[PDB]
Design a protein around this ligand. Structure first.
Ligand SMILES: [Fe+3]
Length: 329
């Protein structure tokens, strides 16, 4: 079988997936890999669809690769994004806290603010900033959601349960887990800050550059540094919360079609990759940012075949995510 069933998360992704499928048909020979689109309501539905042999591939933030590995889904990373450039491929990025200039507060003054997160469980939007915060609370509210809900004065945490924790959806009611939620993802969390809904956006170092083309506009923003100071958004290298690994395509650990997923993706970056074509762009869309893959990605690299999720993420990140979810301090 030469079809890779790609899992698209809701409507904008499904639109781009269809364009992906149709543009690959225009350049890959008829005996080559083809794209079929499967649409689901959230990454987690895609994880389950893949484990159940209803879909083959989906791209996940590395924090979500954790959930993807857990039994009984047992998926594995097979193809990783890289950032930066072909010339120096980065398989990491920086988690940063973006704030508006002249809002005055520092990192130790986040209590009571309104917070914009990319989504529950994601590296920059959640695992890093909450992972740094949780234990350092004097309060054992500590199985996360309730503790974060009380610490901030209202949030948008896409994919959180708004019935159980309404505070975490105050800025984005329903906490929708797809780009139909306008405050989902890196650029949704940035808009949440830009719009004045929240006081801080937990996103990545490219995010503000993806959204504000003009240096004068960007000058109205700053980064919160862990030593309770602020720096210009250009100085993320010296002012970030953490470095985290690349988003990656996951697949079944057995019968995953990983070899065919690589073939589809490699041939796709060849024809429609970074600045390759004006007919189609793997890495951007008129339909939204970060659909199917990150806009900030410049291409794909194959994951070594021995490497399971825990090896991909590494010991410190797997341990932190495990500890963060158990509230162990
Ligand atoms: Fe991410």
């Amino acid at each position: 079988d030469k079809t890779v069933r790609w899992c698209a998360v809701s409507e904008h992704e499904a639109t781009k997936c269809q364009s992906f499928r149709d543009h690959m048909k225009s350049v890959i020979p008829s005996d080559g890999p083809s794209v079929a689109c499967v649409k689901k309501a959230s990454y987690l539905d895609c994880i389950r669809a893949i484990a159940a042999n209803e879909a083959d591939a989906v791209t996940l933030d590395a924090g979500l690769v954790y959930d993807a590995y857990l039994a009984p889904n047992n998926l594995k990373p097979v193809v990783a994004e890289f950032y930066g450039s072909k010339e120096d491929p980065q398989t990491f990025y920086y988690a940063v806290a973006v704030v508006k200039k002249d809002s005055g507060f520092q990192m130790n003054q986040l209590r009571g603010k309104k917070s914009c997160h990319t989504g529950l469980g994601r590296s920059a939007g959640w695992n890093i900033p909450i992972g740094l915060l949780y234990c350092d609370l004097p309060e054992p509210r500590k199985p996360l959601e309730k503790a974060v809900a009380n610490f901030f004065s209202g949030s948008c945490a896409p994919c959180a349960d708004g019935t159980d924790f309404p505070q975490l959806c105050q800025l984005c009611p329903g906490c929708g887990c797809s780009t139909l939620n306008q405050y989902f993802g890196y650029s949704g969390a940035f808009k949440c800050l830009k719009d004045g809904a929240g006081d801080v956006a937990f996103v990545k170092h490219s995010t503000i550059f993806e959204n504000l083309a003009n240096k004068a506009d960007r000058d109205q923003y700053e980064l919160l540094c862990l030593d309770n100071t602020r720096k210009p958004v250009d100085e993320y290298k010296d002012c970030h919360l953490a470095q985290v690994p690349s988003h990656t395509v996951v697949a079944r650990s057995m019968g995953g079609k990983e070899d065919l997923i690589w073939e589809l993706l490699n041939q796709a970056q060849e024809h429609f990759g970074k600045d390759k074509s004006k007919e189609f762009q793997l890495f951007s869309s008129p339909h939204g940012k970060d659909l199917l893959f990150k806009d900030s990605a410049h291409g794909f690299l194959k994951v070594p075949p021995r490497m399971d999720a825990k090896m991909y993420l590494g010991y410190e990140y797997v341990t932190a995510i495990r500890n963060l979810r158990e509230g162990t301090c």
